[PDB]
Write a protein that binds this ligand. Sequence first.
Ligand code: CL
Ligand code: CL
Ligand code: CL
Ligand code: CL
Length: 273
Amino acid sequence: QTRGDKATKILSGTDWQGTRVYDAAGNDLTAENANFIGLAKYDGETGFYEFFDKNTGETRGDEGTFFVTGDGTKRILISRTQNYQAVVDLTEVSKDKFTYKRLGKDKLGNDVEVYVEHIPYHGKKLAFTNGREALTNQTGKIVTNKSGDKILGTTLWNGTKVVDKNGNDVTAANQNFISLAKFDPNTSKYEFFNLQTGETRGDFGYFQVVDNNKIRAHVSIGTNRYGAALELTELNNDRFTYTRMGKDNAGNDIQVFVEHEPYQGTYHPAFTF
Ligand SMILES: [Cl-]
Ligand SMILES: [Cl-]
Ligand SMILES: [Cl-]
Ligand SMILES: [Cl-]
């Protein structure tokens, strides 16, 4: 069990409610950062979260993938309904108290570091509006009795091939998806690098393999901020493959499958963050 695994178990064990927002000195800034206060339901098994309104109990319409980094230091959210991502530094994860810090506002409207406290919620029984759906795309063995993250951590990887749903090669139509990829399971850091030059593609941040090894989720904190929760269709020491939208050889928009295998080139890329 990692420190992230321990945190995730605690987040999954109860519903939560934000209580107060404080600066480090304990000045109450809740009214100036009211939007940081709501209810939450976390399901570690499916790597899924949903937020609800503190006063009414109704969904905030914000659901998606969450995780805690392996080292226990950060929570990542990737919203599939509200088109954002967030990384926050965790300061406590205990059965009676969950706290993170981030940027907020003081009474004069200045930027300050604030701490958002939460305690267990025992009000309305909360249910996911949608939940993690079934994921049924598969192109090879998907290992489930070992940590997905640890499988990615075994080697540098590179994209080797892109195929359509019938196995037709469409790699030349999707070269933008072909990178040298580095994954660190302990820190949950990933970075993509150019295969020709060894240099970062400027796409880097935090990743985790979630949902019984069926999703690779990541958030880019680089030049172009985005997140993704990509369904894995093969995952083992020889190969991993995810599916997403791409192009066919004619330039039509189609479902594609991006295969990766352990990298055999000469580069030994370093994280640039
Ligand atoms: Cl998601
Ligand atoms: Cl393991
Ligand atoms: Cl082919
Ligand atoms: Cl394997």
